[PDB]
Subunit: 99 residues, 4 copies
Amino acid sequence: ARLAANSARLLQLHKTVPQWHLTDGHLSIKRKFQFSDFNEAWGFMSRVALYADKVDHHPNWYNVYNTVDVELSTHDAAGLTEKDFALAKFMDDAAKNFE
Amino acid sequence: LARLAANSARLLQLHKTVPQWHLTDGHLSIKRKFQFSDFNEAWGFMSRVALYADKVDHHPNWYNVYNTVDVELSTHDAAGLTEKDFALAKFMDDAAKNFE
Amino acid sequence: LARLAANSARLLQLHKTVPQWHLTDGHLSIKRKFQFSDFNEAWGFMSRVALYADKVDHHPNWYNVYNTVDVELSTHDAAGLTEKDFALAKFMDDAAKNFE
Amino acid sequence: ARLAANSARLLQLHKTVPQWHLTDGHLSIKRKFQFSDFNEAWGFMSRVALYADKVDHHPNWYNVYNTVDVELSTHDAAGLTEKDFALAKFMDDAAKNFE
Ligand SMILES: C[C@H](O)[C@H](O)C1CNC2=NC(N)=NC(=O)C2=N1
Ligand SMILES: C[C@H](O)[C@H](O)C1CNC2=NC(N)=NC(=O)C2=N1
Ligand SMILES: C[C@H](O)[C@H](O)C1CNC2=NC(N)=NC(=O)C2=N1
Ligand SMILES: C[C@H](O)[C@H](O)C1CNC2=NC(N)=NC(=O)C2=N1
């Protein structure tokens, strides 16, 4: 179950994915990725897809062209869990390759 | 190419070909929401739409959660609908048919 | 898991479920060659197989040219066929069905 | 039509994609990509896919796990053309992100 706002464990995880913003009573984390074209954006998403289905944890993301806008939270626990941070972390790494 | 006009005859004609889609409001764009069994399908779906989109250089605004993919289409440089939006819409429906 | 043995009863039974596939030679692996209209389909196809493969951690050897995707499956750490190879094979056939 | 072996134009293109080997009477170019896992390999392939269908020119590639083994040539001209080099180049760039 579901990580608590300003919680010790929470802030400790959020340390490792600093570029992501917390909602709005710590119920989720958002971040907005920007890549050079759609081709890059897709390459990105593609890796995230493979990982997501693997660990059975999925993003809510909104792609337009080179933008990919993500908001993450554990549905089944109605807020943040460990899973959301492992995802955000993966995304951050995957996206780093494009810098 | 030239920005199509609301309830225009051209427009309504194309729309007839892609009936599952709702027009905004008015008639600035077209929405539809796909539902597949799982993520795996949804992605198989999106994957093909990706290929087509980069080909014809015209891209969706879609929002994916799990097995649902929620699209809204319109030519940005046209600030409304044009031919390309319906070209897309149709692919997309065909692509999505295979999962029925 | 345990390396399945040639013409073994277990083996033949699974194979019955995935009949379009040819066994090597002998019976170290299983081959099949998919043909779709275009590349776009083939990729839609591969895309889903990708998702599944990284999930179940068991991966194909496939060779893609355009609209044909040519697979050969076998558990490497087992140096022959095992359950996983047939799990795959079946997905793959289902995945590929949607394009008929 | 179809670039000629040791041709001036040929060697000049091949300069820009040095890591690729020439066949065997300059009929095509091969190269073997190696990534950390399949997840990376797919991210790679995914970008190459998008470009390929766009420029209507496709690879012959053979993926196993983290390996992707490519051989490129213009089918319709039975040998190398410009197209093969634009592809190889794209691949090289796409793959560079993983170093
Ligand atoms: C229960 C549900 O049908 C699936 O197993 C998924 C999809 N992946 C998921 N992703 C997220 N973020 N929360 C979930 O509860 C979740 N469960
Ligand atoms: C003109 C522009 O900079 C790019 O070529 C793009 C990106 N892809 C596009 N996608 C959509 N939907 N409309 C466009 O006008 C468009 N043009
Ligand atoms: C044990 C090994 O290092 C990895 O976990 C992998 C890579 N994926 C694999 N794929 C296949 N086909 N057989 C394996 O044994 C396998 N194991
Ligand atoms: C003629 C053919 O059906 C397609 O238009 C393709 C696929 N892409 C291609 N790729 C390569 N390498 N050579 C081709 O001739 C080619 N043509």
